[PDB]
Amino acid sequence: MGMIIMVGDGMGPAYTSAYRYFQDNPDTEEIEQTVFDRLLVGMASTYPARESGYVTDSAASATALATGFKSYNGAIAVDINKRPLTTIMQMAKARGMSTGVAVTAQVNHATPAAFLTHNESRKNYEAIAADMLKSDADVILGGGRKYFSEALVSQFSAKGYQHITELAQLDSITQPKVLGLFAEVQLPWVIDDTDANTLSKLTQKSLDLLSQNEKGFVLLVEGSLIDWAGHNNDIATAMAEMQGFANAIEVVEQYIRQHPDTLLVVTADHNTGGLSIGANGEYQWDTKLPKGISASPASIATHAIAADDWQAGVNQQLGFDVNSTELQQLTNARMQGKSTLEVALKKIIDTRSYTGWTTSGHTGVDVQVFAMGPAADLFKGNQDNTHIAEKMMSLLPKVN
Amino acid sequence: MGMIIMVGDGMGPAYTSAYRYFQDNPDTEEIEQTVFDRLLVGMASTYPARESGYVTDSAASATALATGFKSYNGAIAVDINKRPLTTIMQMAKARGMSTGVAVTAQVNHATPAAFLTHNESRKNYEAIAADMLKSDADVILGGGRKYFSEALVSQFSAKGYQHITELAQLDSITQPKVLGLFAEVQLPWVIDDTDANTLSKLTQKSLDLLSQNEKGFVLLVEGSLIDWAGHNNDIATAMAEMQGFANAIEVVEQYIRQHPDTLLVVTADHNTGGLSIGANGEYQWDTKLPKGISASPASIATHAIAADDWQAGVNQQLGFDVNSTELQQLTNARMQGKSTLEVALKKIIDTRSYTGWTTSGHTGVDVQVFAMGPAADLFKGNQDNTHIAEKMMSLLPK
Ligand SMILES: [Mg+2]
Ligand SMILES: [Mg+2]
Ligand SMILES: [Mg+2]
Ligand SMILES: [Mg+2]
Ligand SMILES: [Zn+2]
Ligand SMILES: [Zn+2]
């Protein structure tokens, strides 16, 4: 059977709840269900191994999801004693099934890394990239050109991989073994791109290849930038990444309607930023304003710094006109640089929209577990994140 | 059948998740499950009627859970056109079933008010109180002596209600119709009390009386002060209220083990304060420190401002010795008053515990739904809060 594990990096309960309200049609009376609402089946604890406290990082959480083992923050498929653990992908391969990963961050980032490689530290990018050549994964799509040298790519070409760097080349890929690196590091923010279908395209392509194996497959799809946006406390950019992730989930749903013998599992590796729908004593979340933001605070700050006359440009991208107080704040910030300007912009956006945050890091709240397919009910209720791995693994073909 | 609807007021996902870690035994390697972990079945959206935006208040959400209808923020069992809605309590009474409410806030606060009365505004405390005289609820336990005049109490007595004001009198109550008002307004914080069993006692007493009705009953239990602590961004006091609510939930589980034909549903009305486990870039939550706090910042402050030698007192109640800079922040806040001192203490608690907050009000994140009993599966997955009402109502006899 086919299997798809989708991870909304840093997508705690607030993110999915926010997405519903953000996408709510202001003209329709009721609030329309989102794909998350339709697929919710349970929740999961995200804590790492005891020695790391109660707040996990992406490496530890991904390790739990791919191996069913807890481990220290930073660990990449190795246990607390740095012993390499068998990932579900290895189990799949050992069973002659196809495997793959499609993400928006570098293909060698923590999450995908924990599914295809083993390393005592997530910081070892080049070694992890090289180790991926041992996984023999059929599909590797995402960013991270910076981490693969001409010589490494050559080794990948020798083992039968087709190397591509432009989305325009996807159409010509119709056979297993593809290494697609579509960006130096992470792919472009959805809010600043031509549309929100890039992750969906990598997903649809993965399914097209993987599904040609009668024995089945295990595909990992990660909405990696939800987390990055969360760290930046960037709500407008976060919601855009949420749409990109939701579109991909839709891609898989359609696939399942056409391939009934499949299991889809969607979850978060952890929560990021402490996002809150409503803030500062305000009992409301102004979604009308966010929808009007057509660019990332970074994009808006870059432009504002490059233009002599920038004020009109900022209001045009924010979707509203800044007042005198906020104008002076953008003015001072601009003199101090791009970074300080972005922060100034996000402060205005957050104050205007009543969006809250508690940290630039992670938080420990349990995340949601979603699923679709015959075995969906195995993931009902509360469970630890490691249990998600054990369940998916229990569906793989018999030992003999 | 027997039915129990337990509401953890303001108890979003962060609270129950925090509670697990807060309760985590430092000695055992594994993190033990909580009663919430064992009972979780789904989640619910909490938004109120469209005219009120996406963020609900307690009155609107309580109305949804009790009637299955959305309404504006502040509404007490009336729709957007201010029309009175039939609550599950009314439906229950109409079926000859017993009803009751047990809470830690005033008995006429938003939530319980939505289950027993009808009013266009939660603020009309006097009318709501008077209106409870018409609900015919067999059990009404909580705080709120402040809202029941001697004449009103007199009227309740004429209807067969036994009036009590001290927990010492519970034992003497063995028959239907009791008005228990155990405080001027809300009951004492769990962290400043003798133990976290007060709500469990009101709960157990409700079950004892209600279960004597062969036709069944519908009981509302609310851990009301979780929300209050959340509003004051008070984590140590919030965790204590969670313990008291978790104990009450345990009382009901025990009950069910002895009364198989029962349904328990636990949920929250909405989230409060934007609480977060970890904060300010720190990837951790210092639970060792919170556990050491033995009193509410409020209590700590009042005592500190009242005392001469207060330095050692604060450290003693915080469980850790404050530092140079923190002492001066406290010394100064202490000069302005109890309130400014409380804020200074909470700032220190949050900073050193890595506990975050985003507001003093509510937030819109969905909340969890827990259930136990034969019909527990009806509450699986995602649902709107109004649907929890519909499902519970569908199990009513007829
Ligand atoms: Mg990653
Ligand atoms: Mg929220
Ligand atoms: Mg209340
Ligand atoms: Mg949290
Ligand atoms: Zn992160
Ligand atoms: Zn509240």
Candidates A160, A158, A152; CA nearest to A132 is A152
**A376 touches A295 (CB < 8 A):** no
Amino acid in position A23: Q
Q: Give the count of beta carbons closer than 10 Å to the beta carbon of residue A60.
A: 29
Cα–Cα distance measured from residue A308 to residue B291, given in angstroms and rounded to the nearest whole number: 56
Rg, chain B, Cα only: 21
End-to-end distance of chain B based on CA atoms, in angstroms? 12
What's the token pair of residue A172? 């010509």
Candidates B67, B143, B78; CA nearest to B108 is B143
The ligand placed nearest to the CA atom of residue A362 is 5
Looking at the fold, whether A120 and A204 belong to one and the same domain comes out as yes
Looking at the fold, whether A128 and A256 belong to one and the same domain comes out as yes
Phi, psi of B188 (to 5 degrees): -60, 150
For residue B167, with 0-12 CB atoms within 10 Å meaning exposed, 13-18 middle and 19 or more buried, which class applies?
A: middle
Interface contact flag, B364 A55, Cβ < 8 Å: no
B222 annotated ligand binder: yes
Looking at the fold, whether A197 and A79 belong to one and the same domain comes out as yes
The ligand placed nearest to the CA atom of residue A186 is 1
SS (H, E, C) B237-266: HHHHHHHHHHHHHHHHHHHHHHCCCEEEEE
**B90 touches B141 (CB < 8 A):** no
Please, which residues bridge with residue A217 across strands? A2, A98
Give the domain extent around B319. Answer: 274-358
Cα–Cα distance measured from residue B15 to residue A38, given in angstroms and rounded to the nearest whole number: 25
- B50 interaction partners in chain A (CB closer than 8 Å): 29, 31
Length of chain B: 398
State CA A166 to chain mean position distance: 20
**B369 touches B59 (CB < 8 A):** no
Length of chain A: 400
Cα–Cα distance measured from residue A109 to residue A113, given in angstroms and rounded to the nearest whole number: 6
**A305 touches A341 (CB < 8 A):** yes
The ligand placed nearest to the CA atom of residue A272 is 5
What's the token pair of residue B222? 């609310």
- B56 interaction partners in chain A (CB closer than 8 Å): 283
Candidates A241, A181, A222, A232; CA nearest to A4 is A222
**Residue A367, min C-alpha distance to chain B (Å):** 9
Amino acid in position B143: G
**Residue A49, min C-alpha distance to chain B (Å):** 9
Produce one character per residue of A185-197: b if its CB has 16 or more CB atoms within 10 Å, e if not: ebbebbbeeeebb
**B183 touches B143 (CB < 8 A):** yes
Helix (H, G, I), strand (E, B) or coil at B382: strand
For tokens 């297993």, name the residue: A176
CATH number, domain with residue A307: 1.10.60.40
Helix (H, G, I), strand (E, B) or coil at A238: helix
For residue B134, with 0-12 CB atoms within 10 Å meaning exposed, 13-18 middle and 19 or more buried, which class applies?
A: exposed
Looking at the fold, whether A293 and A145 belong to one and the same domain comes out as no
For tokens 């806040």, name the residue: B333
Amino acid in position A222: E
**B197 touches B247 (CB < 8 A):** yes
What's the token pair of residue A370? 């979603």
For residue A167, with 0-12 CB atoms within 10 Å meaning exposed, 13-18 middle and 19 or more buried, which class applies?
A: middle
Looking at the fold, whether B166 and B255 belong to one and the same domain comes out as yes
Please state at what angle helix A338-353 crosses helix A235-258, rounded to 10 degrees. Answer: 70
Q: Any idea what DSSP says for residue B180?
A: E
Helix (H, G, I), strand (E, B) or coil at A335: helix
Looking at the fold, whether A211 and A278 belong to one and the same domain comes out as no
B79 annotated ligand binder: no
Looking at the fold, whether B54 and B192 belong to one and the same domain comes out as yes
Helix and strand numbers (H, E) in chain B are 16, 14
Helix (H, G, I), strand (E, B) or coil at A248: helix
State which H helix or E strand residue A240 sits in.
Answer: helix A235-258
Q: Which residues of A are catalytic?
A: 58
Q: Give the count of beta carbons closer than 10 Å to the beta carbon of residue B203.
A: 26
Interface contact flag, B53 A365, Cβ < 8 Å: no
Interface contact flag, A356 B360, Cβ < 8 Å: no
**B359 touches A276 (CB < 8 A):** yes
Helix (H, G, I), strand (E, B) or coil at B144: coil
Q: Any idea what DSSP says for residue B203?
A: H
Cα–Cα distance measured from residue A151 to residue B6, given in angstroms and rounded to the nearest whole number: 63
B118 annotated ligand binder: no
Nearest residue, CB atoms, B361 vs list A12, A33, A283: A283
Cα–Cα distance measured from residue B285 to residue A208, given in angstroms and rounded to the nearest whole number: 44
**A41 touches A380 (CB < 8 A):** yes
SS (H, E, C) B304-348: HHHCCCCHHHHHHHHCCCCCHHHHHHHHHHHHHCHHHHHHHHHHH
**Boundary of a domain, candidates A325, A340, A358:** A358
**Residue A180, min C-alpha distance to chain B (Å):** 33
Looking at the fold, whether B167 and B266 belong to one and the same domain comes out as yes
Q: Which residues of B are catalytic?
A: 58
Amino acid in position B236: A
Q: What share of chain A is helix, strand, coil (3-state, %, to 5)?
A: 45, 15, 35
What's the token pair of residue B146? 């402040």
Beta-carbon contacts below 8 Å between A and B: 183
Cα–Cα distance measured from residue B195 to residue B129, given in angstroms and rounded to the nearest whole number: 29
Helix (H, G, I), strand (E, B) or coil at A68: coil
**Residue A31, min C-alpha distance to chain B (Å):** 9
Interface contact flag, A279 B274, Cβ < 8 Å: yes
Helix (H, G, I), strand (E, B) or coil at A120: coil
Amino acid in position B165: T
DSSP code per residue over B155-179 = HHHHTTPEEE-SGGGGGG--SS-EE
The resolution, in angstroms to one decimal, equals 2.2
Cα–Cα distance measured from residue B222 to residue B4, given in angstroms and rounded to the nearest whole number: 11
Distance from Cα B215 to the centre of ligand 3, integer Å: 28
**Given its phi and psi angles, is residue B160 left (phi above 0), alpha (psi -120 to 50 degrees) or beta?**
left
Cα–Cα distance measured from residue A180 to residue A206, given in angstroms and rounded to the nearest whole number: 11
The ligand placed nearest to the CA atom of residue A102 is 1
Phi, psi of A29 (to 5 degrees): -60, -60
Distance from Cα A365 to the centre of ligand 4, integer Å: 4
What is the bridge-based pairing of β-strands B98-106 and B217-222?
parallel
Interface contact flag, A278 B277, Cβ < 8 Å: no
State which H helix or E strand residue B6 sits in.
Answer: strand B2-7
Candidates A262, A165, A186; CA nearest to A219 is A262
- B233 interaction partners in chain A (CB closer than 8 Å): none
- B284 interaction partners in chain A (CB closer than 8 Å): 53-55
State which H helix or E strand residue A7 sits in.
Answer: strand A2-7
Cα–Cα distance measured from residue B41 to residue B102, given in angstroms and rounded to the nearest whole number: 24
Q: Give the count of beta carbons closer than 10 Å to the beta carbon of residue A214.
A: 7
Cα–Cα distance measured from residue B285 to residue A364, given in angstroms and rounded to the nearest whole number: 8
Looking at the fold, whether B156 and B255 belong to one and the same domain comes out as yes
Interface contact flag, A274 B358, Cβ < 8 Å: yes
What is the bridge-based pairing of β-strands B355-356 and B276-277?
antiparallel
Interface contact flag, A277 B363, Cβ < 8 Å: yes
Cα–Cα distance measured from residue A297 to residue A301, given in angstroms and rounded to the nearest whole number: 6
DSSP code per residue over A136-205 = T-SEEEEE-GGG--HHHHHHHHHTTPEEE-SGGGGGG--SS-EEEE-SSSSPPPGGGSS-S-HHHHHHHH
**Distances from the Cα of B172 to the Cα of B141, B162, B169, angstroms:** 14, 10, 5
Looking at the fold, whether A229 and A98 belong to one and the same domain comes out as yes
Looking at the fold, whether B33 and B163 belong to one and the same domain comes out as yes
**B125 touches B255 (CB < 8 A):** no
Looking at the fold, whether A171 and A203 belong to one and the same domain comes out as yes
For tokens 């997530």, name the residue: A122
CATH number, domain with residue B53: 3.40.720.10
Q: Give the count of beta carbons closer than 10 Å to the beta carbon of residue B174.
A: 12
B231 annotated ligand binder: yes
What's the token pair of residue A367? 């995340």
Distance from Cα A92 to the centre of ligand 5, integer Å: 28
Tally of domains within chain A:
2
Cα–Cα distance measured from residue B5 to residue B11, given in angstroms and rounded to the nearest whole number: 14
Who contacts A213 (Cβ-Cβ below 8 Å, separation ≥6)? A96, A97, A98
State CA B200 to chain mean position distance: 12
What is the bridge-based pairing of β-strands B276-277 and B367-372?
unpaired
Helix (H, G, I), strand (E, B) or coil at B294: coil
Find, in chain A, the residue whose alpha carbon is nearest to that of B350. A358
Nearest residue, CB atoms, A283 vs list B57, B282, B284: B57
Helix (H, G, I), strand (E, B) or coil at B223: coil
**Residue B64, min C-alpha distance to chain A (Å):** 15
∠ CA A267-A227-A100 to the nearest 5 degrees? 55
What's the token pair of residue A229? 């946006």
Cα–Cα distance measured from residue A388 to residue A41, given in angstroms and rounded to the nearest whole number: 12
Please, which residues bridge with residue B351 across strands? none
Amino acid in position A399: V
Distance from Cα B142 to the centre of ligand 4, integer Å: 30
Interface contact flag, A281 B360, Cβ < 8 Å: yes
What's the token pair of residue B235? 């984590």
